[PDB]
Amino acid sequence: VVLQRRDWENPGVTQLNRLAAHPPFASWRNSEEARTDRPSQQLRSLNGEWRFAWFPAPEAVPESWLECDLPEADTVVVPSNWQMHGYDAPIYTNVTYPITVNPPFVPTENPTGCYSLTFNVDESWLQEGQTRIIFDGVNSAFHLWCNGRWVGYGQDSRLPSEFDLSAFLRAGENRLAVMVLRWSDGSYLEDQDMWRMSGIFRDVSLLHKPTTQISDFHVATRFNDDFSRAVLEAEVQMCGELRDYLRVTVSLWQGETQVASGTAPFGGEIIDERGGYADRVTLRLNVENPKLWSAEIPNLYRAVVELHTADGTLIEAEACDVGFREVRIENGLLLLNGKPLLIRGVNRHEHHPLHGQVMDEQTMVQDILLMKQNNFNAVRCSHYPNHPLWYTLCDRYGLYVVDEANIETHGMVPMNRLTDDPRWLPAMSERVTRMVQRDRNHPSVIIWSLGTESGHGANHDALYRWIKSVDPSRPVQYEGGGADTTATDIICPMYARVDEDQPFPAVPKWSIKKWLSLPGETRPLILCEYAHAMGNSLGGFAKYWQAFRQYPRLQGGFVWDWVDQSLIKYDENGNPWSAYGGDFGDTPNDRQFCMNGLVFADRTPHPALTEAKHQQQFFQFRLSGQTIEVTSEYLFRHSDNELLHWMVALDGKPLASGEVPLDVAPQGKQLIELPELPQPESAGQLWLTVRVVQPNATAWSEAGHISAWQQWRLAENLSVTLPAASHAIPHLTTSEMDFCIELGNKRWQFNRQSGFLSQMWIGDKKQLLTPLRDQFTRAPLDNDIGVSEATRIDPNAWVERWKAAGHYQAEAALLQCTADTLADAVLITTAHAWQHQGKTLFISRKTYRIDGSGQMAITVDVEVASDTPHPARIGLNCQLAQVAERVNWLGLGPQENYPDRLTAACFDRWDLPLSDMYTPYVFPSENGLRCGTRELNYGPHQWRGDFQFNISRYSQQQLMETSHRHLLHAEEGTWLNIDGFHMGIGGDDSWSPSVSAEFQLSAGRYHYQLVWCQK
Amino acid sequence: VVLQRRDWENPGVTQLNRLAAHPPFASWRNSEEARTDRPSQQLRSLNGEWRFAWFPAPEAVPESWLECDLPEADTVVVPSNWQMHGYDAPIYTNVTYPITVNPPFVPTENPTGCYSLTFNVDESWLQEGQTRIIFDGVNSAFHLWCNGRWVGYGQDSRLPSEFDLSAFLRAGENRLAVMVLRWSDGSYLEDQDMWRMSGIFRDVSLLHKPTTQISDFHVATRFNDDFSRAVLEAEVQMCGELRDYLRVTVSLWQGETQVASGTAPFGGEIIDERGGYADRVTLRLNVENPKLWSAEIPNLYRAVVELHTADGTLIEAEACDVGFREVRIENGLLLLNGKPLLIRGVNRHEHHPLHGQVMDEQTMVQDILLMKQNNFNAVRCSHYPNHPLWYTLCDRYGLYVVDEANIETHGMVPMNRLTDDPRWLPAMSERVTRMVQRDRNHPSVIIWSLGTESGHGANHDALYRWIKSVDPSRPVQYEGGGADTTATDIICPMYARVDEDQPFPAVPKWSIKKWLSLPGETRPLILCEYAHAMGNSLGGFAKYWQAFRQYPRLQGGFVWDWVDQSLIKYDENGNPWSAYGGDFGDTPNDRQFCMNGLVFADRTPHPALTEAKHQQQFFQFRLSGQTIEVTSEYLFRHSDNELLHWMVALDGKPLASGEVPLDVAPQGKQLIELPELPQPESAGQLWLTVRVVQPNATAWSEAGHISAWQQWRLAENLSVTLPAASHAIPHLTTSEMDFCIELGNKRWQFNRQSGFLSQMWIGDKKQLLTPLRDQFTRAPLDNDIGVSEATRIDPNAWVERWKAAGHYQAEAALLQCTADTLADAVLITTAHAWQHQGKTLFISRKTYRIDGSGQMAITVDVEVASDTPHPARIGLNCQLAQVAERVNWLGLGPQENYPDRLTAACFDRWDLPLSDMYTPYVFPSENGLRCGTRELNYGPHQWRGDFQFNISRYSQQQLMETSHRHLLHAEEGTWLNIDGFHMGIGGDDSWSPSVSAEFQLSAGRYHYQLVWCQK
Ligand SMILES: [Mg+2]
Ligand SMILES: [Mg+2]
Ligand SMILES: [Mg+2]
Ligand SMILES: [Mg+2]
Ligand code: NA
Ligand code: NA
Ligand code: NA
Ligand code: NA
Ligand code: NA
Ligand code: NA
């Protein structure tokens, strides 16, 4: 019958014989074990070694398999995705569905996973009560057999499916058989931008409950106006036979102290003309001066729910963690415990590079620590309900959660083709309701979300009202259909810009500042997705946070996203490398669009991460005279684990420094008086750096953790002294093909046909492998490329503007090249013009001055044609012969920084190994820049001026021709790029031009100067 | 798989392979036929003779039935209910489920109907296009096979279920097999107070459409401030292969005149980031000064939707009737076309005494004509979507409709057990959504309803918002959970009273005047059920209408209900009788509670109908001197078919009459002067009577139809003349046992032991069969009985208060009986005491004065113990010897009227046959009373005074002992009851006391006088 019905091609059938959803159960038979959240004997794990066989379709599955293990089958770990074991390929597609769009049908070649397990069941579990099996995650649909008999069917990859096995088991050995289909009618609602995989990827377990049992329970907390009194309200439901002797007790614990308690018989209030719920009871407990829950201080109580007899004999007990907090919207502001929130959030998919989409505790804890260490306070479950342990961990560590239902239909045309169709309402409702029924008691969950990218349909409206009706404690949001529909309490756009309107038809993304004050609008605005962190990204990030602070109704957003979705492949010699879309034969695919993280697959930080930490600081600073003003952005806590370190330095050289304790109230101010500063000996700029240090370790950080910092310029003494004139005078040697200059053990050569410095000698040794030439291009970033491909060009992306304008193909034509001997120097003058098909793009005019002391002063003036696309950079490059261990500079650092992403960097003297001067982005591009530099040292070379640079073993050319980082090979010597000017990187999104006007190189005339010498 | 799946015990499966729901289609291939609504060749009826066999379960059905006709099966007529043909019993239950409550399961003994049909299909339908089958109604679930192969499955008994037969049909003979189950998981949502039947009870048809087709269309009409401009908006959706040459044209017609037109290609406006619906188009037509639709004047246009090509080739045509009207709630008022409605409504089930739940045109038309003739302007579809033809007739004749979803869970405990469970959301949503998708283009449908008596659950909220999202042109209403929840735009209580609060816990029925002004309340109030019309009922009906008129926000209600649900059975002689609950072996049952109508099952009126007509009049009246002031309650029309008849009479005798045209604007007044009336000579009371008459016939009434009336007392001249002094004197004859009085041929006898008038003689004929005695009781009405039964007594009911107090068993004790001889008369004086168990209930003191003219003046004074329950009446009864043909009276008439139901009756001189003085209620009770009577004539007898009376061949004893009207037999002679005072009949409901305080007999001391003579 099962192969005849094809329930996996019927959106009217989403389960068969499946049990009702509920909060996490353990069925404790002792109240103390429940209180302390220790393991339960009534909850067994079935994870471990199972039997597995792969089939191309469900028609290919032999009928013997229902009763006998297949000898052809293998032994594999569960939980797992079968693509991670090599049985078939994982696919990466973004918008376009991985199957033909023909609802409700799927392909006839539908890969099939046959899992089986032989296991023991104890006699005690069968004599009394109810034994159930629980599958936490099966992708995407499945049929279940026990001892050869059919049990039932289930869909939705991301929520538990449970079945009663009481009538099916025997004492001793038992056999489970699970048939997992890769594709089903459920797939039409699971079109998230991620790897498409399948199998049993979350926990399997077995739970024993009594016959008379707790079948559901709800906890609520409401408050008086000043939060000095609370009422905890708990509604409990039972199953089994109803008797007068039955009782529930809900008791509230704080550590080992019981603070409140209530006991009552079953039989709720009268509800209508037919009475009340005889199988339900409500308990109300008064709590005076409750400790409140927030992400700043995650205060938790333990609630224990006991079903028992009047006389006091336990039947069973459940329990959960309780956080006393209020979430409400008033006067256009989202409030937590009466104060306006500021969301420092991120989006987080469940991803591991080795295990695929299987989640474990070690990884989850690793993620939460990094988040909190980097000033984040909120997370979005993009875009499905998470592993149940996630919520418990957020409750305990302190993070605000947006729990989101497993619905995305991005690939339909138009986007709401299913979500407006009443025949898809049943399948949709189950994905929203079963989420709310499971997670409604977690305090970390503050907002419900209806899914993502499914346009706006009437089904969203019904399900919105359903949530508001069953759970008034929490606001509901939904971005689809323009981000401000009747199905959202919060304006929640994706990738809307700070100042810039993007007036798309029907679904415009307004500037967030403008969006608030549209006629009739009153709601708060929090971006569900912003600052697309693909590759070298996060430009313009400070612009959001400046707006967030100034505008009360702008309350933050969630960065896209946390972690790169790369996977590990192995080569011939057995070495691992990071792979993205296409790398498995998967076609069509969306290549590297699956890598948008602030961290790599293995949780190493991208440079963008430090920019997020600095801008998301909790302390704000102002300087007046000798006075630092410190302001706190905390809403509830004092600065009880904070001190201020201050230091003053003269061009990197330390002069004075000290410490002061921080004692600031939430929203308060503290004025710190700096002592009399000693007077500086010499020329240079004085800088002040402050940083907030945490002396004591926490649950989430180490002793000495740095949480905030800020810099200021102090007094400047400009250099007014002439370097006393030297004895020596440089000598010029004119040839037809070269101008050569000599001074002691140093030699310079200017080629008279190319017009550039072709070689330079210290003593006798060659310093250059390539001539010193102008450069107006960069190895293109992901933001520069957008969705542009070889076979389908988008002419609007920056890379295509540059290609079509000939910027990459342009050839330097020499206009002028003269030499003159002066009293104490030699002066070389050059001029070049870069042309493409008869159009002059660039003109570069230079003078090189070599004086008696071996210093070379280079002066550059560039003209750029007003009607060419603004250049990526204006600077110089060369390949040095020398390979040295260390790079030393006086400028912004120590990490990678660009003009629109440099606020986190500080001015000082930095020193790193060469390999650190390279950011290993999986898709290679321009990387490693440092800005605002006054001095650079590498080997015996020193450059001075006011410039930006990168230094590495990889040419811009290798970087732009190579697609995977592991395919790069180090070149002879070190490629040096020194720019007078560099274009911003943008990243408000990664599919259209996103570099803001004030970071484009549009001035038409540019000037910079540099001194090159030996040290 | 069909027997193994058991899809009828699974609320997660409500259909298999069923096509989407849609507005009435006919697939016309000629535009002129679509416009004129003439028959289509592409829509065949399959109604007529089919084959049928009955089984006790689906397991008992032979497999040969799929392949071949069963020799044992009978030929029967479809549509029908198989209970109406005798195959099993119909069941009457009100609240309690007809099956054991154990969701989702049904009994293993499940009466199965096996239907089959052999039919031919036109050759062309096989070559190309799509052939579907439509079942408008199947009760309650079914499986379908064509030519032995399985097609699909269907639930919901009240909306059409459609299937594609294209891959199934063949040349020549085809056979349909339809397996119909009585019970399903669908029955849990179908617990309406009604007979429970089964089968194929609505139409069956075949529809042939092109492969490229119209699959959906919506029509909407919106207006400017004063309705002088309209825009008609029509959205159209297609199925099949998209071609650039395709087009849609929507044209609007009034008769043969095209008023507006619009044409466009497919491809709607951009909706989201993925574009728009390429398979859809939206047309907008301008209409200046549109004829507006209302129930007063049902102005209709015709819209024709053509799917064609660019060069003018038609593919197919659909169509509908369009009414230009706006429905909105503003400032707490329900407005139609800017004006506040006053709903004169009624609930109506689909019921026929012979054919059960099968509807036909003739019965439908008959129903509508009788409603309009009685001043009803609105109907409620209790409690499911009706036969499609009903909405077409309502559009055309003009009645406001409340379309109701087929959801009632009355029998659950608590009432919302299912409707609050997310696992019942899918089954529920299909009942709401598929109603709306079908009926949204009907103009007569002004309000959507979510069902009835299912409590208030979160599923109601979700479906409330769904309707408001897809159709904002109509308010949504729902009564469950207290009548004023968040799932209704209208306060819509059932049986809430005018002045009296009933503060039930959780779900109080506040008095309707009070309900309006509760703190925070702003909504309009229209009762969804009021004035329960069970048996002798509708007392206090005037009180509702007075308040409807004084309070702008009380906008009317729907009477419960239209027609008695009695069925026809046949006895031993084959003579018909009216049957109710229990008479088919059906048990448990709710007896006569299925009979609640204003009309009998055959559409003969109850007396209550005329009271509805009068209180619901559209013209109000005031008299001031010679001035009659007429006011119109019409909102839209002038009195263009209305004249006023006036007449003045002196104690029934005509003195003057006239006619005046009526020309009153909507909400207008008109003053009409009376000519000065000729002076009346003799004593008496003058009465003015006015009626409004329609001189011309309409679509719903004949010429001469009376639509409104009113009466006033004018001048009274009190009688002062002495009667003619008679010359004879009455003689007394005493014995120990009797006082006899004699005058001429006349003779009176008084029993000195009982104390009553025991016999009277006119010459030598006895006039009495039973002595003249006080009576304080009545054969209890349904309102008297309530839910009280022999096996479960309700002590609070009036009949039980009377039974327990001994009213029915009280025996008369004689206290005093004397005779005196005066100058010209004989005086008899009596005193009686009625006692029960040593307690005195009533005392009656009488005098009888028999004088020289032969007249007998009876004076009566009664005491009623304040602590006894107030009596049903204070009067006299006796059984007269004579049986006569006519009854003639001066008083309120001509129909049955009671003290709290007599506003419709007029004071005049009435003359009827004796049988019209008896109302044949199916469950017999007190009936046929007439109030305000000053003179009664019957045979040679005449009674003068100021009394209430009823006259018949049936004693109060027989009426109370007999349960069915057909089991009554005429008694010898005639039973007369003459009351001085009679209690009200009540009727606000029929399950608690409902007679208002001022219509109960509580004065304690009563007085009345009669004169009995032979005229
Ligand atoms: Mg399915
Ligand atoms: Mg997407
Ligand atoms: Mg079913
Ligand atoms: Mg009911
Ligand atoms: Na803000
Ligand atoms: Na992505
Ligand atoms: Na590259
Ligand atoms: Na009113
Ligand atoms: Na009834
Ligand atoms: Na009776």
CB A509 within 8 A of CB A518: no
CB B713 within 8 A of CB B751: no
Resolution in A: 2.5
CB B600 within 8 A of CB B606: yes
CB A438 within 8 A of CB A390: no
The answer to whether the Cβ–Cβ distance between B465 and A470 falls below 8 Å is: no
| B414 in reach of chain A (CB within 8 A) | yes
Q: Are residues B679 and B572 both part of a single domain?
A: no
The answer to whether the Cβ–Cβ distance between B458 and A481 falls below 8 Å is: no
CB atoms within 10 A of CB B661: 11
CA nearest to A284, candidates A230, A214, A238, A227: A230
CB B63 within 8 A of CB B100: no
Distance from the alpha carbon of residue B10 to the mean position of ligand 3, in angstroms: 4
The answer to whether the Cβ–Cβ distance between A425 and B433 falls below 8 Å is: yes
CA nearest to B599, candidates B370, B363, B402, B383: B370
What the block records as the tokens of B866 is: 């304040």
State the Cα–Cα distance between residues A902 and A614, nearest whole angstrom: 10
Query: For A924-982, where are the alpha helices, taking DSSP H only?
Result: 956-961
Q: Tell which of A155, A218, A271 to mutate to test the B interface (max B CBs under 10 Å).
A: A271
Distance from CA of A539 to the nearest CA of B (A): 25
Asked, as a colleague might, if the bond just before A588 is cis with ω within 30 of 0, I would say yes
CB A320 within 8 A of CB A441: yes
What the block records as the tokens of B154 is: 């269907």
CB A13 within 8 A of CB A427: no
What are the residues whose beta carbons fall under 8 Å from the beta carbon of A724, sequence distance 6 or more?
A: none
Q: Are residues B185 and B258 both part of a single domain?
A: no
CATH number of the structural domain spanning residue B180:
2.60.120.260
SS3 A369: helix
CB A232 within 8 A of CB B467: no
State the Cα–Cα distance between residues A316 and A123, nearest whole angstrom: 20
Classify residue B37 as left (phi > 0), alpha (psi -120 to 50) or beta: left
Q: Are residues B678 and B812 both part of a single domain?
A: no
Q: Are residues A640 and A782 both part of a single domain?
A: no
- Residue keyed to tokens 């353990």: A26
| A481 in reach of chain B (CB within 8 A) | yes
CATH number of the structural domain spanning residue B455:
3.20.20.80
A536 carries a ligand binding annotation: no
CA nearest to B498, candidates B558, B543, B555: B543
Buried b (16+ CB within 10 A) or exposed e, A110-133: bbbbbbbbeeebeeebeeebbbbb
Which contiguous run of DSSP H or E holds residue B5?
helix B2-5
Active site positions of B, annotated: 453, 529
| A507 in reach of chain B (CB within 8 A) | yes
What are the residues whose beta carbons fall under 8 Å from the beta carbon of B47, sequence distance 6 or more?
A: B78, B79, B203, B204
Q: Apex CA A280: angle with CA A276 and CA A281, to 5°?
A: 105
Distance of CA A291 to the CA centre of its chain: 31
Which residues on adjacent β-strands are paired with residue A195?
A: A92
CB B490 within 8 A of CB B477: yes
CATH number of the structural domain spanning residue B916:
2.70.98.10
Residue A926, CA distances (Å) to A12, A243, A419, A951, B343 in order: 52, 74, 42, 11, 76
Distance from CA of A240 to the nearest CA of B (A): 14
Distance from the alpha carbon of residue B185 to the mean position of ligand 3, in angstroms: 5
| A461 in reach of chain B (CB within 8 A) | yes
Distance from the alpha carbon of residue B582 to the mean position of ligand 3, in angstroms: 30
Strand A400-404 with A445-449, pairing: parallel
| B3 in reach of chain A (CB within 8 A) | no
Q: Are residues A449 and A306 both part of a single domain?
A: no
The answer to whether the Cβ–Cβ distance between A506 and B269 falls below 8 Å is: yes
Residue A336, CA distances (Å) to A226, A295, A400, A402, B307 in order: 13, 10, 10, 14, 56
The answer to whether the Cβ–Cβ distance between B461 and A466 falls below 8 Å is: yes
| A272 in reach of chain B (CB within 8 A) | yes
Which chain B residue's Cα is nearest to A416? B272
Looking at this protein, which amino acid is placed at residue A587? T
The strand ranges marked E within A852-894 are 856-864, 873-880, 886-893
CB atoms within 10 A of CB B60: 12
Which chain A residue's Cα is nearest to B17? A10
Which residues on adjacent β-strands are paired with residue B731?
A: B742
* Beta-carbon pairs below 8 A across chains A and B: 139
Q: Three-class SS string for A48-103?
A: EEEEEEEECCHHHCCHHHHCCCCCCCEEEEECCCHHHHCCCCCEEECCCCCCCCCC
CB B454 within 8 A of CB B418: yes
* Length of chain A counted residue by residue: 1015
Of the ligands numbered here, which is closest to the C-alpha atom of A512?
Answer: 5
A529 carries a ligand binding annotation: yes
Instruction: Give the torsion through C-alpha atoms of B199, B202, B206, B208, to 10 deg.
Output: -140
Q: Are residues B763 and B645 both part of a single domain?
A: no
CB atoms within 10 A of CB B892: 23
CB B1002 within 8 A of CB B916: no
Residue A973, CA distances (Å) to A876, B268, B354 in order: 17, 61, 104
The answer to whether the Cβ–Cβ distance between B276 and A414 falls below 8 Å is: yes
Q: Tell which of B274, B280, B432, B991 to mutate to test the A interface (max A CBs under 10 Å).
A: B274
Residue B279, CA distances (Å) to A427, A480, B275, B989 in order: 24, 22, 12, 53
CA nearest to B215, candidates B142, B298, B138, B316: B316
State the Cα–Cα distance between residues A548 and A710, nearest whole angstrom: 19
State the Cα–Cα distance between residues B440 and B460, nearest whole angstrom: 19
Distance from CA of B414 to the nearest CA of A (A): 5
SS3 A27: coil
- Residue keyed to tokens 């006692």: B835
| A14 in reach of chain B (CB within 8 A) | yes
Q: Are residues B140 and B196 both part of a single domain?
A: yes
| B505 in reach of chain A (CB within 8 A) | yes
CB atoms within 10 A of CB A257: 8
SS3 A445: strand
Of the residues B161, B178, B210, the one at which a domain ends: B210
Under DSSP, the state recorded for A809 is T
Which chain B residue's Cα is nearest to A3? B1
Q: Are residues A866 and A922 both part of a single domain?
A: yes
Q: Tell which of B16, B193, B465, B495 to mutate to test the A interface (max A CBs under 10 Å).
A: B465
A277 carries a ligand binding annotation: no
Q: Apex CA A139: angle with CA A138 and CA A141, to 5°?
A: 85
Strand A643-650 with A653-661, pairing: antiparallel
Query: For B297-424, where are the alpha helices, taking DSSP H only?
Result: 361-373, 389-397
Residue A284, CA distances (Å) to A219, A234, A288, A303, A575 in order: 10, 7, 13, 12, 61
Asked, as a colleague might, if the bond just before A605 is cis with ω within 30 of 0, I would say no
The question of whether A529 is a catalytic residue gets the answer yes
Which contiguous run of DSSP H or E holds residue B144?
strand B141-146
Distance of CA B669 to the CA centre of its chain: 32
Distance from the alpha carbon of residue A81 to the mean position of ligand 1, in angstroms: 21
Number of alpha carbons in the 13 Å side-chain half-sphere of residue B189: 32
Q: Are residues A330 and A269 both part of a single domain?
A: no
Query: For B273-360, where are the alpha helices, taking DSSP H only?
Result: none
- Residue keyed to tokens 């659909």: B318
Q: End-to-end distance of chain B based on CA atoms, in angstroms?
A: 85
State the Cα–Cα distance between residues A935 and A432, nearest whole angstrom: 59
SS3 A5: helix
Q: Are residues B810 and B932 both part of a single domain?
A: yes
The answer to whether the Cβ–Cβ distance between A413 and B274 falls below 8 Å is: yes
Of the ligands numbered here, which is closest to the C-alpha atom of B551?
Answer: 8
Which chain B residue's Cα is nearest to A464? B462
State the Cα–Cα distance between residues A204 and A165, nearest whole angstrom: 14
Q: Are residues A376 and A503 both part of a single domain?
A: yes
The alpha-carbon radius of gyration of chain B (Å, integer) is: 33
Catalytic residue among A162, A190, A404, A453, which? A453
Of the residues B146, B179, B210, the one at which a domain ends: B210
Distance from the alpha carbon of residue B428 to the mean position of ligand 9, in angstroms: 24
Binding residues of B for Na(+): 193, 593, 596
What the block records as the tokens of B668 is: 């207008």
Binding residues of B for Mg(2+): 408, 410, 453, 589
A969 carries a ligand binding annotation: no
State the Cα–Cα distance between residues A587 and A37, nearest whole angstrom: 47
Distance of CA A95 to the CA centre of its chain: 19
Asked, as a colleague might, if the bond just before A894 is cis with ω within 30 of 0, I would say yes
Residue A420, CA distances (Å) to A409, A456, A751, B543, B904 in order: 11, 7, 71, 47, 53
CB A200 within 8 A of CB A138: yes
| B277 in reach of chain A (CB within 8 A) | yes
- Residue keyed to tokens 């001391």: B1005
| B465 in reach of chain A (CB within 8 A) | yes
Looking at this protein, which amino acid is placed at residue A343? I
Distance from the alpha carbon of residue A581 to the mean position of ligand 2, in angstroms: 15
A510 carries a ligand binding annotation: no
The answer to whether the Cβ–Cβ distance between B14 and A12 falls below 8 Å is: yes
The answer to whether the Cβ–Cβ distance between A273 and B415 falls below 8 Å is: yes
Residues before each break in chain A (C–N > 2.5 Å)?
A: none
Residue B167 belongs to domain spanning: 1-210
CA nearest to A973, candidates A885, A879, A886: A879
- Determine what percent of chain A falls in helix, strand and coil, rounding each to the nearest 5: 15, 40, 45
CB B388 within 8 A of CB B397: no
A530 carries a ligand binding annotation: yes
Distance from CA of A274 to the nearest CA of B (A): 5
CB atoms within 10 A of CB B682: 10
- Residue keyed to tokens 């089919």: B50
Of the ligands numbered here, which is closest to the C-alpha atom of A591?
Answer: 6
Query: Ligand 3 (ion): which residues have CB within 5 A?
Result: B 10, 13, 185
What the block records as the tokens of B954 is: 């049936």
Which contiguous run of DSSP H or E holds residue B541?
helix B541-550
Distance from the alpha carbon of residue B200 to the mean position of ligand 2, in angstroms: 47
What the block records as the tokens of A222 is: 């409401």
Binding residues of B: 94, 193, 408, 410, 453, 529-532, 589, 593, 596, 991
CB A643 within 8 A of CB A662: yes
Distance from the alpha carbon of residue A821 to the mean position of ligand 2, in angstroms: 66
CATH number of the structural domain spanning residue A291:
2.60.40.10
CB atoms within 10 A of CB A789: 10
CA nearest to B794, candidates B532, B991, B984, B503: B991
Task: Report how many domains make up chain B.
Answer: 5
Distance from the alpha carbon of residue A923 to the mean position of ligand 5, in angstroms: 36
Which contiguous run of DSSP H or E holds residue B264?
strand B257-264
CB B153 within 8 A of CB B142: yes
Of the residues A183, A210, A237, the one at which a domain ends: A210
Q: Are residues B744 and B889 both part of a single domain?
A: yes
State the Cα–Cα distance between residues A684 and A701, nearest whole angstrom: 37
State the Cα–Cα distance between residues A725 and B65, nearest whole angstrom: 119
CB B283 within 8 A of CB B233: yes
Residues 643-682 of B with CB under 8 A from A: none
Residue A77, CA distances (Å) to A134, A555, A767, B798 in order: 17, 44, 57, 77
State the Cα–Cα distance between residues A463 and A485, nearest whole angstrom: 14
